[PDB]
Write a protein that binds this ligand. Structure first.
Ligand SMILES: OC[C@H]1O[C@@H](O[C@H]2[C@H](O)[C@H](O)[C@H](O)O[C@@H]2CO)[C@H](O)[C@@H](O)[C@H]1O
Ligand SMILES: [Cl-]
Length: 410
């Protein structure tokens, strides 16, 4: 009673995804972004493709580069990917890691000097995520020890043990900040879904390589927090910002976050092997995916950006929600068996190929307007790394491999 696309279709999609990853995405990052002046990678690449080796460099971007090349090396084996990950790792430990107070700085100057020394949990999470993946890829003990040290600092200085979840930003010496905003766009509230999603993500990857008992409890608490406070069963959307007691302080809807969470929550529960929690997580996951299908898509199947605090639909197609929809829709199909989710995955992929990818300049456009016009945004910057689209391709390749195996051997 399985309804499954035929083998030609599954294999054709898998091949296209692999080609996009290796011949466009990773090719762009390995060739255009390495910096031989300061080492590591440039912090910015302009709309015209100009790299800027003197621009400030963000911890999140650099951790994303490390994660992506580590993950690609682990799954595909190409030696270039290990070389690129090694390059990212060396710069990261040298300059982003605070050897004195622990954790990673927010931003360094191109030459490595600390430039913004705040310790934001979002950045600490990406550090944990990337270091754990590099350990998974190479067995490096320093990388795992560092990830563990950062985990301890988050729990020590940030955990809210009265309410659940985490204070999201501290200064260099882990004294917490009033302003935990990631950027000007974010509500000036003490708790965000966004930061907590990436804590969950990091903690799941850390647990894969270091199954500590207390970590399992912390990861489970986060899953439970999502189900209780963040996911909204009446709407099928995540609430974005809260006070310390998880009282909602936002009405915005982010389709990209919804569909990303839809698969990351299940990844986390499965890493834990938490069979008791799984049915509820699966229910919320499928709902998030259906709500995204019904409300967050253009007729071409791409994802809109958000519904803002005053209700306005932002119809811009940003690069990362398309990536997350590819994974989230394939995941929804795997969980539910409902082929409408595969069709949605196929539609977003076609959009990615026909509109989101920048065939001219390489990689993917950050933003495409509702009329199809690309915006002249930076190709690489503090917030645009290779992780959403790189991961989306790697995930799709493996998920399609598993779907292909539903035709049993004889
Ligand atoms: O809110 C701060 C920034 O968010 C950026 O989007 C990120 C999103 O919040 C989410 O964490 C996802 O996982 O990653 C994306 C991309 O970095 C956004 O691009 C940036 O302009 C800021 O608004
Ligand atoms: Cl990214």
């Amino acid at each position: 009673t399985e309804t499954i696309p035929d083998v030609r279709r599954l294999r054709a999609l898998q091949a296209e995804v692999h080609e996009e990853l290796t011949e466009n995405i990773l090719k762009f990052w390995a060739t255009r972004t390495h910096d031989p002046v300061h080492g590591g990678f440039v912090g910015r690449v302009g709309p015209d493709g100009r790299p800027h080796p003197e621009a400030p460099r963000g911890a999140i971007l650099n951790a994303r580069i490390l994660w992506t090349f580590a993950a690609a090396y682990r799954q595909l084996g190409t030696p270039l990917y290990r070389e690129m990950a090694e390059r990212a790792y060396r710069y990261f430990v040298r300059h982003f890691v605070d050897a004195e107070h622990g954790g990673v700085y927010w931003m360094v100057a191109a030459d490595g000097r600390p430039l913004d020394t705040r310790k934001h949990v979002y950045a600490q999470s990406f550090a944990i995520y990337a270091l754990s993946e590099w350990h998974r890829a190479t067995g490096g003990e320093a990388a795992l020890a560092l990830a563990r040290s950062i985990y301890d600092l988050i729990e020590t200085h940030c955990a809210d043990r009265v309410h659940g979840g985490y204070v999201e930003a501290c200064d260099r010496a882990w004294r917490p900040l009033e302003d935990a905003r990631l950027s000007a766009k974010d509500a000036p509230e003490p708790r965000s879904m966004n930061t907590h999603l990436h804590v969950l993500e990091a903690y799941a990857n850390l647990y894969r390589v270091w199954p500590e008992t207390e970590l399992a409890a912390r990861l489970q608490a986060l899953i439970e927090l999502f189900l209780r406070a963040i996911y909204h069963p009446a709407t099928g959307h995540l609430i974005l910002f809260f006070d310390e007691r998880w009282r909602p302080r936002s009405r915005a809807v982010s389709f990209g976050h919804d569909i990303e969470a839809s698969w990351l929550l299940l990844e986390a529960v499965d890493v834990l092997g938490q069979a008791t929690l799984r049915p509820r997580v699966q229910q919320a996951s499928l709902h998030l995916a259906r709500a995204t299908l019904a409300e967050g898509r253009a007729p071409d199947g791409s994802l809109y950006y958000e519904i803002g605090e005053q209700g306005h639909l932002d119809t811009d197609r940003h690069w990362w929600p398309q990536a997350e929809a590819l994974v989230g829709f394939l995941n929804a199909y795997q969980e539910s068996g409902e082929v409408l989710f595969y069709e949605a995955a196929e539609d977003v992929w076609r959009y990615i190929r026909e509109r989101q990818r920048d065939t001219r300049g390489g990689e993917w456009f950050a933003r495409v307007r509702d009329d199809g016009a690309p915006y002249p945004d930076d190709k690489v910057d503090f917030w645009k790394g290779p992780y959403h689209n790189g991961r989306a391709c790697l995930e799709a390749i493996q998920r399609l491999r598993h779907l292909l195996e539903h035709v049993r051997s004889r």
